[model samples]
Target: AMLYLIFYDITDDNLRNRVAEFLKKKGLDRIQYSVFMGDLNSSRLKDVEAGLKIIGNRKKLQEDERFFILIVPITENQFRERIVIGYS
Candidate 1:
């Protein structure tokens, strides 16, 4: 398993709320607004990717509008080495 960090920048309020619910339903921990984290194997990771793709496909975004999401993976050791600079 690997630690996965999912973050998004969604222009629409409804869509953003849906995105947040989806991630929470998938068992990810909400580490911050717009960001979620959890441990996932390759298969589970693919599931998340596909789920987000479907949500993101709902409407055609304007050229200037945005609905960007990034799924980043980190090693357990790397995550353990992370430094927290402020209170949660």
Candidate 2:
């Protein structure tokens, strides 16, 4: 199993839309705003990277330091039986 974590600043809808469009193009449908996690291969990751590069090239986002991608692989068991614990 694979996990892709993307954290970006939500300064504007344009950046958000760009990220969404990129994921959609790669057949990654299920997404959560501000983050997306799913099964992906090297090819898909490459596509995502390319899309991000395009976004980075945009003048509007050139100086945006709030955008980044983190990719990691996980075990199927770990992926499936995950739990979220919170404390306030």
Candidate 3:
């Protein structure tokens, strides 16, 4: 397993809540209101992406609406190389 970051921009209240809960259920740590961190291997990563797709597929968004999600993976060395400029 490797480190991963999940960031999202979900407008719907229910859907957003569900997504957060889902990530939490998968043992992800919330770094911020719209960001989560976790570790998952190839299969597990696919599982997570699939789950998110299922949740998002339930709603058909309008042209003005958006439901964005970004799943980023990083190495241990890269993860440790960070610069914190402010308080959490």
Candidate 4:
């Protein structure tokens, strides 16, 4: 398994909640408002991708709204390259 950072930016509340619930169902731990930290292998990654696709098919989005999901895998070297702008 590899460490992954799963995060999202969804406009609609219902959709956002659905996304959060999906991650939780998969045993991921929430680390921020819309960020989740966990481990995922190739099969797990595919599962997440497929789940998000299903959400995209839920409804048409608004002109001013957007849905974005990112699954970033990290290695020890990359983790050492952390660059925080402004956070407490």
Candidate 5:
């Protein structure tokens, strides 16, 4: 299983909920309010990208009402090589 990182910024609450629900349905775990992380193969990733596009169409994709989803694929080794400076 390949690791996938999904992040999005959506202005509408209803849109955000739809995106979040879609990710969960795709078997991704919520890493943050607007971030999801989990395993997905290339095909599944394409499917996700397609769904995200539908949100843009619904909102007319204005700058003031921005919506975006970023997808990153990390190798197992790449994921292991990381650093964190956060509150304990």
Candidate 6:
């Protein structure tokens, strides 16, 4: 599966909610409070990127020290392990 991590720095509730709604409209859901994770078929990455661009433009969210999107591939085994064991 693919993992997408979106980190943003927005403290306003309304802006945050708007971003969340935008994500849902683009088929991305919040798997965590600050981190948004979702699966992307090869074709959907483009759509995800577009959605992220919109979110990235929010001035309210830009106050965050870090605002970026990261994508990684993971195997079922890694998911089950539930730990990042080798990052030391």
- Find the candidate with the highest lDDT and give its number: 1
Q: Global lDDT of each model?
A: 0.88, 0.63, 0.87, 0.85, 0.83, 0.62
Off by over 4 Å in 5: 59-63, 76-88
Sliding window of 10 residues with minimal summed lDDT for model 2: 58-67
Tens-digit lDDT track for model 6 on 4-24? Answer: 555455566665676677667
TM of each candidate vs. truth: 0.82, 0.62, 0.82, 0.81, 0.78, 0.55
Q: Which stretches of candidate 4 lie over 4 Å from their true place?
A: 76-88
lDDT string for model 5 (1-88, tens) is: 6898788988888899999999999889887789888888879888988988886677455668877788888776776786745679
Taking all chains together, the TM-score of candidate 2 against the true structure is 0.62
Candidate 1 wrongly placed segments (more than 4 Å): 59-63, 80-88
User: Global CA lDDT of candidate 2, please?
Assistant: 0.63
Predicted candidate 2 versus true structure: per-residue lDDT over 1-88, tens digit per residue? 3665554554567777887777666765343565556677788777777777887665454455355555556555765776755576
Residue by residue across 1-88, what tens digits does model 3's lDDT show? Answer: 9899889999888889999999999889898888888899989898899999998986556776679999988776876895656776
**What is the alpha-carbon lDDT of model 5 when measured against the actual structure?**
0.83
What is residue 69's positional error in candidate 4, in angstroms? Answer: 0.5
Tens-digit lDDT track of model 4 for 1-88: 9988887999888899999999999988897789887888889889988998999785555688878899898775775687756566
Instruction: Give the higher-TM-score candidate: 5 or 6.
Output: 5
TM-score of 3: 0.82
* Residue 54 lDDT (model 6): 78
- lDDT digits (tens) for residues 29-64 of candidate 1: 998789898999989988999999998896656776
- Rank list by lDDT: 1, 3, 4, 5, 2, 6
Better of 4 and 5 by lDDT: 4
